[PDB]
């Protein structure tokens, strides 16, 4: 058992609004998600999309070069 010192004040669940917080600070929520995550998102999307587009281009070039 860890020895802890703290004071915790809590309000009853029936004295607070339950759902409005979903839509509060919404620009901050979007901004934090984008600014913290855009590198991770790039590192995930870029190789997949690039490989797919290159494969499509390869297939189109191969199809054209076999025609008459």
């Amino acid at each position: 058992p860890v020895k802890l010192k703290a004071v915790v004040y809590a309000l009853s669940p029936f004295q607070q609004k339950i759902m409005t917080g979903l839509w509060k600070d919404l620009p901050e929520k979007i901004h934090h998600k984008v600014s913290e995550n855009w590198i991770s998102a790039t590192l995930l999307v870029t190789p997949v999309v690039g490989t797919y587009w290159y494969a499509q281009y390869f297939k189109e070039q191969e199809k054209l070069e076999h025609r008459f």
Partner: protein
């Protein structure tokens, strides 16, 4: 006082205790003290 019979006690308890909010003040080594939700749930009996 004599007017307070068993049915009176139950009526008053249902007015003041049953499924009611509670206030808790605790100090010391109280990590094993149950949280507010557990105390709040124990204000009613679902077997009844």
């Amino acid at each position: 006082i004599d007017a307070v019979d068993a049915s009176t006690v139950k009526r008053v308890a249902n007015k003041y205790i049953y499924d009611k909010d509670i206030a808790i003040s605790a100090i010391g080594p109280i990590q094993d003290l149950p949280d507010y939700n557990k105390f709040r749930r124990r204000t009613y009996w679902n077997r009844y």
